[PDB]
Amino acid sequence: EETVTCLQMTVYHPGQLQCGIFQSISFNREKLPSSEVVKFGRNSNICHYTFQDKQVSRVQFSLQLFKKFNSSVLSFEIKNMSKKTNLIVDSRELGYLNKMDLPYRCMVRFGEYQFLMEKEDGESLEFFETQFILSPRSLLQ
Amino acid sequence: MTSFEDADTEET
Numbered sequence: 001e002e003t004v005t006c007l008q009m010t011v012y013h014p015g016q017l018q019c020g021i022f023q024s025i026s027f028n029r030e031k032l033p034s035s036e037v038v039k040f041g042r043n044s045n046i047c048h049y050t051f052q053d054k055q056v057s058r059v060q061f062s063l064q065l066f067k068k069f070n071s072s073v074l075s076f077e078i079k080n081m082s083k084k085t086n087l088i089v090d091s092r093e094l095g096y097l098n099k100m101d102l103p104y105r106c107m108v109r110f111g112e113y114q115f116l117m118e119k120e121d122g123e124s125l126e127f128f129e130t131q132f133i134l135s136p137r138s139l140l141q
Numbered sequence: 142m143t144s145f146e147d148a149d150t151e152e153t
Contacts, residue, residue, distance in 0.1 A: 043146050054151045084150045 004031070004129055005074050005122035007063075012114045012135040022134070024050040031129040034074060038063040038130070039081075049132075055111055057082035063102075065128060073121045074128060076102040085110050107139065114139050 006029075016022055024044070032038070032048075041047035041059040051060075059081045065074045079099035080087040087094040088109045094100065108115040116139050122128065 042150070045146070052145075054145075054148065055153070057150045058146070082150070084152060 002123035003121075004124045004127055006120045006129050006131060007076060008118050008120070008131045008133060009108075010116040010118075010133040010135050010139065012137070012139050013112050014138065015112075016134075020052055023052055025132055027132045027134060029129050029131045031127050034065045034126050034128060051113075053111075055085075056113070057084050060085075060110065061087050061108075067125070068101075074125060076119065078102055078108065082110070 011022065013021055038049070039047040039059055039062045040049045040051070040056075042051055042053060042056045043058045044050050047059065061078055061080050061082070064077045064079065066077060067074050077099055078087070078089065078094075080094040080096060083096045087098075088107075089100065090103065090106045092100075102117070102119070105116075105118045108117060114135075116135075
């Protein structure tokens with residue numbers, strides 16, 4: 001047992017309050033193993049995090065950890081998975097199955113969703129924890 | 142009626 005990387009993502013969607021968009025999401029720390037691939041989707045099957053939205057692709061994007069070559073800590077990689085809608089990460093649009101390495105902090109966006117992500121490094125390499133946080137107000141401007 | 146998890150993705 002040692003310090004663990006934490007990825008914290010703050011979400012906003014306008015009208016998150018209406019049809020239980022975020023109904024299926026836990027807003028508590030979760031610990032996960034590095035081996036896992038985290039998916040985000042409209043499909044209760046095969047997603048850790050599920051959005052009850054007609055407009056979010058059945059699977060929307062996924063995270064995946066690794067470590068850089070000369071680095072002693074874990075980093076995240078985000079891949080898009082939606083033919084329909086592009087994933088914008090800090091102004092760069094990712095098409096279907098495009099992927100990239102995540103900055104320590106970034107805005108990930110798609111449709112009217114907004115995710116603000118922020119990583120804090122840990123010692124550990126076999127587990128990481130993720131935490132969801134809710135934003136009252138839009139994270140732009 | 143519509144089946145939710147499996148439906149097509151809707152744009153709008």
